[PDB]
């Protein structure tokens, strides 16, 4: 309702979009596209140095628009701005995560949900929490209707998932990790290792979050944007 | 049954009808008797001796190969324990539960299970005292029991 305000302040304007400027956002080189869109900051006035306000921005953007295909439509990628040079501001990997509809469609009943997570450090000193999910499946010829695992099977499977994630993330850097997360090779490594314990469909690697970043070291950042 | 639980399972050995056994067995009574007392000299209870005779050697059960039972053979050869085997195992189970309870006081389940274990100990001790294989005034108390285990 427009008129119910008693006092707008206790005590007692010029257009703010002329004062702002555009900036093109660039992806790192482990992505088929670079141009994800545009962002706004103020003009870099004498007090402000608008690049510095514009440093800490995260833009989450779908893997389909980064990679062209539509098979990646349920994964989103967080891109952190990490240096600004002249209108084409340069980002870096900040985290993968799924979409709400994809996870809500996978989790059904009369099957067992199996999760694992590790907190492992990579070769160039980022600290990553990788999450993995998997779901039990029926055999063909199976006539009983639920197909649960026997909760030691789950414990063994979670051990194998944790050891595979830890083995792959040390000895990969982050750019190697993004180029591993794109083709879904971790999912196939898990399914190859766990088929001898229980069937276990839908073996997606869930979100990855950066937890502690190392110091800036600009050469490796400029190594991405060619 | 299962006097300190609600279980009603029926799982036991079903020994055969032949009291003279098994007509593929060629060994003599004295050989399995010396085997029994050899196993007893290295410190094994009658249960473990019977298990070893059943699996490694073919000894269906020692009462039908020899004439008497394994504990009678041990008692006659002079290697009988000071307290019977089931009493000893119940006392060492009790001493493990008490050591855990000293460590973890907030385990009310361990307190309950300890009461059950000591009830079983008193029932066996009353029976063994009434047949005089334990001397009267044999009493289970905890500070003595930690040492009767050795």
């Amino acid at each position: 309702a427009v008129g119910k305000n008693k006092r707008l302040s206790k005590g007692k304007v010029v257009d703010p979009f002329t004062r702002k400027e555009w900036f093109d956002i660039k992806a790192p080189s482990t992505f088929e596209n670079r141009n994800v869109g545009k962002t706004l900051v103020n003009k870099s006035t004498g007090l402000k140095s608008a690049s510095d306000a514009l440093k800490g921005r995260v833009v989450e953007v779908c893997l389909a628009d980064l990679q062209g295909s539509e098979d990646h439509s349920f994964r989103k990628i967080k891109l952190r701005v990490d240096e600004v040079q002249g209108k084409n501001l340069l980002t870096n990997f900040h985290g993968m995560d799924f979409t709400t509809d994809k996870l809500r469609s996978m989790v059904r009943k009369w099957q067992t949900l199996i999760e694992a997570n590790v907190t492992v450090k990579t070769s160039d000193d980022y600290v990553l929490r990788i999450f993995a999910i998997a779901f039990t499946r029926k055999q063909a010829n199976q006539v009983k209707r639920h197909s649960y695992a026997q909760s030691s099977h789950i414990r063994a499977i979670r051990k194998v998932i944790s050891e595979i994630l830890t083995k792959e993330v040390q000895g990969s850097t982050l750019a190697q990790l993004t180029s591993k997360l794109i083709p879904e090779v971790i999912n196939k490594e898990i399914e190859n290792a766990t088929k001898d314990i229980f069937p276990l469909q839908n073996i997606h690697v869930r979100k990855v979050k950066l937890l502690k970043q190392p110091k800036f070291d600009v050469g490796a950042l400029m190594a991405l944007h060619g | 049954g299962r006097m300190h639980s609600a279980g009603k399972g029926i799982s036991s050995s079903a020994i055969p009808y032949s009291r003279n056994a098994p007509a593929w067995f060629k060994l003599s009574s004295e050989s399995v008797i010396e085997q029994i007392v050899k196993y007893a000299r290295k410190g094994l209870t009658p249960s473990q001796i019977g298990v070893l005779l059943r699996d490694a050697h073919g000894v269906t059960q020692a009462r039908v190969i020899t004439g008497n039972k394994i504990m009678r053979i041990l008692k006659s050869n002079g290697l009988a324990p000071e307290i019977p085997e089931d009493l000893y195992y119940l006392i060492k189970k009790a001493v493990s539960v008490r050591k855990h309870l000293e460590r973890n006081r907030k385990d009310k389940d361990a307190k309950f299970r300890l009461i059950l274990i000591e009830s079983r100990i008193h029932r066996l001790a009353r029976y063994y005292r009434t047949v005089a294989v334990l001397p009267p005034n044999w009493k289970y108390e905890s500070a003595t029991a930690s040492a009767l285990v050795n």
């Binding site: 539509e70 439509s73 979409t99 509809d101 809500r104 469609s105 | -």
Partner: protein, 97 residues
């Protein structure tokens, strides 16, 4: 008299089942006694579907879904015509329609 052999809930061998909250009135109800339904819906509700399909930057687009599991007390489920009162002979039917 005893109206249902199952006491109006599903609890044979627990003693206690941890409760949930009604989505409609915030009443505490045991999880076995509740009236659980699963509301699966497209987000665009089939009347805006043509306008958004022609307004998309993408062809072939997914038109994604919302998934929700609704937990109802007995009073709110009866009031919202989700379950209703049945005849004495027809209470024993467990099948969905």
């Amino acid at each position: 008299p005893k109206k249902r052999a199952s006491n109006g809930r599903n609890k044979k061998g627990r003693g206690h089942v941890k409760p949930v909250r009604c989505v409609n009135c915030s009443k505490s109800i045991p999880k076995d006694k509740a009236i659980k339904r699963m509301a699966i819906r497209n987000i665009v509700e089939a009347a805006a579907v043509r306008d958004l399909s022609e307004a998309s930057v993408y062809p072939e687009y997914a038109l994604p879904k919302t998934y929700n599991k609704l937990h109802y007390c007995v009073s709110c489920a009866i009031h919202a015509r989700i379950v209703r009162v049945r005849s004495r002979e027809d209470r024993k039917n467990r099948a969905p329609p």
